[PDB]
């Protein structure tokens, strides 16, 4: 179940419980410090649950909570856009669109079974994002990768960009 934002965040449903600035959020179904305009009462099916981040009002700036700080009512929250640029760290996360290995071989689709038998079945690891055949890192491996369509190369890693040019 999806842990990153697309567009203004309507369908966001990760579990970020704090504004862009540290402050832990107010549960949506509470009244102190503030009194909110979207109660799981009023806008029921709008993922208004827990204290997690949400965009009920269809805000331009996206997902946002009310802060437990009486002093600033509500504020926005941080939340990686989807798609992906460059891997963060070793990118246990990577949700990007790259399909050609280091060697430079186009990846074999996760869905597929050729030219290689493999148990990385997306069915089996739904949250794991085995889209088409985008390079990935399910298993705490060095850096994402795939099973390559060169029948003699099972798999190998790809050359994903580090955003900030073990981990820090």
């Amino acid at each position: 179940l999806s842990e990153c934002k697309t567009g203004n965040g309507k369908n966001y449903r990760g579990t970020m419980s704090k504004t862009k600035n540290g402050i832990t959020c107010q549960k949506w179904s509470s009244t102190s410090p503030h009194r909110p305009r979207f109660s799981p009462a009023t806008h029921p099916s709008e993922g208004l649950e827990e204290n997690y981040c949400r965009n009920p009002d269809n805000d331009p700036q996206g997902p946002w909570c009310y802060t437990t700080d009486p002093e600033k009512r509500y504020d926005y929250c941080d939340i990686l856009e989807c798609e992906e640029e460059c891997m963060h760290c070793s990118g246990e996360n990577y949700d990007g669109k790259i399909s050609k290995t280091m060697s430079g071989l186009e990846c074999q689709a996760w869905d597929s079974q050729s030219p290689h038998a493999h148990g990385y079945i997306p069915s089996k690891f739904p949250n794991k994002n085995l889209k088409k055949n985008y390079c990935r890192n399910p298993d705490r491996e060095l850096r994402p990768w795939c099973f390559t369509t060169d029948p003699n190369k099972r798999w190998e890693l790809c050359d994903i960009p580090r955003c900030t040019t073990p981990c820090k």
């Binding site: 399910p138 298993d139 099972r154």
Partner: peptide
């Protein structure tokens, strides 16, 4: 070892283990 991890862990190892054995 149930869950993913146990599982992935294993896959990975299996891979790792197999490259291991081709470079040889």
């Amino acid at each position: 070892k149930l869950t993913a991890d146990a599982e992935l862990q294993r896959l990975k190892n299996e891979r790792h283990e197999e490259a291991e054995l081709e470079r040889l």
